[PDB]
C-alpha cells in the first residue's frame, strides 16, 4: 500500500497504478513543496487476532502467545524482468531498445511484534507542506507545525503505526524505544540508478527470541506485522514522471504458548475494568471548593 | 552537529539547514583555501555523568562502572526517500524528473569510552586556512602553522574530544594510542555519486569487552559517546552547491559495576601538601 489505493478496481479509470505511486512532481520553489498524498509510499501493517488462553489464579500465572520465529519473503522479483512497455527507452535518441526497468532508492523493512510498531518522526526539509487530511504527518500528532528539531531528532515526534497505509515511509521510521516488544529488520539503498537486488528461498528463517529467549509476547491477543518494500521507480516516455514500485511481503510466523506471571494486583485491574466500562461524567460538584456533600459520619458500634 | 548550528530556530532566517552543512564553496586558487566554520562537518560527543559508587579509600580495592556492550543505530535512513523539493533534477535538459537524492562520500564512526576520544591530525592539504575562531585545528593545539608532516602521520598533532561540534572530521581522526580506554568503530566510502547503504535492526549488539574481558572503565565517573554519520551531499538547483546530510545515532549501553584497584593515590595529595 504505497500511493494509489486499491479502490478504483478498473484498469482504465485508475490507470491501475495499484502497487505503484501515482507520480512524483517536484517543487516549484524552496519554500513551496506539497507531496500529494497519493504519491507518498506508506507503511503497510496488519494484526492477527489470536484466541484467549488459559490461566491459573492460584499462582497468578497466565498464558500468552509468543512469536518464536518467522520466515519472510518479498514475492515477485521476476516481475521486474518485464522490459517491454511504455517506459523510457535505453536508446532515447531514436526511442529504441529496452524500456528502462525499475531502478533506484530501495527500502526493505519488516517488523513482527506483540504490539503496534512504535515509530519516530524524522524528515528532510521541514518546510514541506504535507496534506493535512488523509495522511499522518508530524503535525497531525503534535498539533503544532514542524520545527527544525524534526529534521534531526525530536523525542517529541513519536507515534504508533496504528492505522495502515497512512504513515509515509519518508516521515516515520522505526523507533528504538527504551523497552520494546517488537523485532524489526530493515535496510536501505539510495542512489538514482542503483540496480535492485533481491533473494528468495523457502529454507532459512529468522529467530525472534530475545537475549533471555522470550520473543515478542502478544499484548491483548493480537500479533502485529508491518512492512514496506520499495524496489525503485519507473520513468515514463514523457516528462520523466517517476512512479515508485513496491512488492508484497509474505510472513510466516511460528508462535507458541508461554506461561507468564501476572504482574498486577487483581483488585487494581478490576477497578480499571470498571472505570473503562463506565461513562466518565460531570454531575454537581461533590468534591473540592464547592462540595455539595454536607456531613459525613463513620460509626463502628 | 555538522556545519549549521542548531541555534537560529526559525525556518526562514536560518533556512533550517539543521542537520545539513551550510554550503560548499571551492577554492579560487591553489594557495588560497579557507573553507568556512559552518561548512565543515564535525564530531558529535556527549558525556553521561554516572553516580559515584564507593568509598573504600583504605583498601586498595574500589569499584567503578564498566561498559559491557552497546547497541547502536543510525536512525532516519528512510527520510532520504524525499525526492520532491528543490534539488538538481534527474533530467536537467528540461529540468524535470526527480530531485536527486542524497549521495556522495559517506563516513560513519562511533565510539564508546570512559575518557574522551583521543584524536590525531591529518589533512589533505596543509595549506588550507581554517578560521582560527570557533573551530579546533592543528594550529589551535600546536600553536604554530601546519607542517608538511601533517599531510601524513605527525605524532605531534594529537588532541582529545573535549568540545562538541568543534573538531572537524577533515582534520581529526580517531587516534590509535597505545593504551586506550575506548572502543571506536568506523567505515568510510568515497566517491562523488556513491549510493548510501544502511541497516536497521534492534536485534544484535556489540560487545565492548577487551581481550581480558574488561571493557571501557568509566574513569572519573563519566561515559563518553562520540559519533559522526555523514550520508552524502545534496546538490541544489543552482550553482551546484553541495551540502552534507547527517543522521542522528542512537546508543544503548549496558553498564555493570566492577571492583578495581584504587586510582586515587593519596600520596599525590599528601605530597601536594608539601
Amino acid at each position, epitope marked *: 500500500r504505497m500511493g*494509489q489505493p486499491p479502490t478504483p478496481e478498473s484498469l482504465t479509470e*485508475g490507470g491501475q497504478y495499484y502497487g505503484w505511486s501515482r*507520480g512524483i*512532481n517536484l517543487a516549484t520553489s524552496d519554500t513551496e513543496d506539497s507531496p500529494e498524498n497519493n504519491t507518498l509510499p506508506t507503511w503497510s501493517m496488519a494484526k492477527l487476532q489470536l484466541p484467549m488462553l488459559n490461566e491459573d489464579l492460584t499462582c497468578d500465572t497466565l498464558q500468552m502467545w509468543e512469536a518464536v520465529s518467522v520466515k519472510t519473503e518479498v514475492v515477485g522479483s521476476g516481475s521486474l524482468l518485464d522490459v517491454h512497455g511504455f517506459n523510457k527507452p535505453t536508446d532515447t535518441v531514436n526511442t529504441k531498445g529496452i524500456s528502462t526497468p525499475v531502478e533506484g532508492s530501495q527500502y526493505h523493512v519488516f517488523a513482527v511484534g506483540g504490539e503496534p510498531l512504535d515509530l519516530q518522526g524524522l524528515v528532510t526539509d521541514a518546510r514541506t507542506k504535507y496534506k493535512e487530511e488523509g495522511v499522518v504527518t508530524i503535525k497531525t500528532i503534535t498539533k503544532k507545525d514542524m520545527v527544525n528539531k524534526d529534521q534531526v531528532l525530536n523525542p517529541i515526534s513519536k507515534a504508533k503505526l496504528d492505522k495502515d497505509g497512512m504513515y509515509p515511509v519518508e516521515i516515520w521510521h522505526p523507533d528504538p524505544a527504551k523497552n520494546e516488544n517488537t523485532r524489526y529488520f530493515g535496510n536501505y539503498t539510495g542512489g538514482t540508478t542503483t540496480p535492485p537486488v533481491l533473494q528468495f528461498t523457502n529454507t532459512l528463517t529468522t529467530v525472534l527470541l530475545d537475549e533471555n529467549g522470550v520473543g515478542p509476547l502478544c499484548k491483548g491477543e493480537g500479533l502485529y506485522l508491518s512492512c514496506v518494500d520499495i524496489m525503485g521507480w519507473r520513468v515514463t516516455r514523457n*516528462y520523466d*514522471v517517476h512512479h515508485w514500485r513496491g512488492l508484497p511481503r509474505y510472513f510466516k510466523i511460528t508462535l507458541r504458548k508461554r506461561w507468564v506471571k501476572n504482574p498486577y494486583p487483581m483488585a487494581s485491574l478490576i477497578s480499571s475494568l470498571f472505570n473503562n466500562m463506565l461513562p466518565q461524567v460531570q454531575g454537581q460538584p461533590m468534591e473540592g471548593e464547592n462540595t455539595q456533600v454536607e456531613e459525613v459520619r463513620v460509626y463502628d458500634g | 552537529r555538522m556545519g549549521q548550528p542548531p541555534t537560529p530556530e526559525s525556518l526562514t532566517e536560518g533556512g533550517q539547514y539543521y542537520g545539513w552543512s551550510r554550503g560548499i564553496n571551492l577554492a579560487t586558487s591553489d594557495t588560497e583555501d579557507s573553507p568556512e566554520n559552518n561548512t565543515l562537518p564535525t564530531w558529535s560527543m556527549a558525556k553521561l555523568q554516572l553516580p559515584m559508587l564507593n568509598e573504600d579509600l583504605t583498601c586498595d580495592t574500589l569499584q567503578m562502572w564498566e561498559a559491557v556492550s552497546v547497541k547502536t543505530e543510525v536512525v532516519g535512513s528512510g527520510s532520504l526517500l524525499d525526492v520532491h523539493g528543490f534539488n538538481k533534477p534527474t533530467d536537467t535538459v528540461n529540468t524535470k524528473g526527480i530531485s536527486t537524492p542524497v549521495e556522495g562520500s559517506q563516513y560513519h564512526v562511533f565510539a564508546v569510552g570512559g575518557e574522551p576520544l583521543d584524536l590525531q591530525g591529518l589533512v589533505t592539504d596543509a595549506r588550507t586556512k581554517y578560521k582560527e575562531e570557533g573551530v579546533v585545528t592543528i594550529k589551535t593545539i600546536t600553536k604554530k602553522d601546519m607542517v608538511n608532516k601533517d599531510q601524513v602521520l605527525n605524532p605531534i598533532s594529537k588532541a582529545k574530544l573535549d568540545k562538541d561540534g568543534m573538531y572537524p572530521v577533515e582534520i581529526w581522526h580517531p587516534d590509535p594510542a597505545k593504551n586506550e580506554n575506548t572502543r571506536y568503530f568506523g567505515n568510510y566510502t568515497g566517491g562523488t555519486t556513491t549510493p548510501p547503504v544502511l541497516q536497521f535492526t534492534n536485534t544484535l549488539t556489540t560487545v565492548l569487552l577487551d581481550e581480558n574481558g574488561v571493557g571501557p572503565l568509566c574513569k572519573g565517573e563519566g561515559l563518553y559517546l562520540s559519533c559522526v554519520d555523514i550520508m552524502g551531499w545534496r546538490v541544489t538547483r543552482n550553482y551546484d552547491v553541495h551540502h552534507w546530510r547527517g543522521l542522528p545515532r542512537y546508543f544503548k549501553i549496558t553498564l555493570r559495576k566492577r571492583w578495581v584497584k584504587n586510582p586515587y593515590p593519596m600520596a599525590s595529595l599528601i605530597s601536594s601538601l608539601f
Partner: antibody
Amino acid sequence: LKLSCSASGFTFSSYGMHWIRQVPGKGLDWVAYISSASDTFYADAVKERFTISRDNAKNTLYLRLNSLKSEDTAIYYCARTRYPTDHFYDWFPYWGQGT
Amino acid sequence: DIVMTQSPTSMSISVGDRVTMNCRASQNVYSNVDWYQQKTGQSPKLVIYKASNRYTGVPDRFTGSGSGTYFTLTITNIQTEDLAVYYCLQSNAFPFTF
C-alpha cells in the same frame, strides 16, 4: 451552479483538465485544475468558492460554481492537457467550445 | 502568483512586416511558457508551446524564444490569418496566470 464539460474520443481519466474563463474585455483567466490522480488546484481569487471535480466513467468535469455567484462572469472554457501523465504542467492545447 | 507583463500593448503593422512581442514574469519560470492565438469568436488556439517549439499545423513564420524571465514571440512575414490577439501564459507553478 454546477457546470458540465463532456469529452469524447480518448481515455478521459488519464488526462488533466483545466478551466479557463474569459471576460470579453480583460482577456483570459485561469480558474482551476484537476489531474489524473484527482487533486484540485484553484486560482487565488476563487479558492473557497468553486469546486472542480471529475466523475470518471461519465467523462465530464463539474466546476461547481461559486454557490454565491456574485461578481464572477465570463465565457467558461475547458482544456485538456496534451499527454496522459501525472505531470501537472503539461501545456493544455485542446480547448473547449466555450459557454 | 506570477504576473506576466507584455511590452507591446497594441501593435499596428501591415502584411509582410515583422513583429516581436515580449513577456516578463515576476519570478523565474524556466522554460514553461505557452503562446496562444485568439481570433474573435474562437477558442484560444495554441501556437508556441514551452516557449521554444511550434505546435503542429503552425507555420514557420511563428517563432518562440527566450528562457527564464524574458520570453519573446516573433513573426517575420505577417499573413492575413495572423490578425488575432496573442496571450503569453506561464505554466510553471500554481496558479497559472495569463
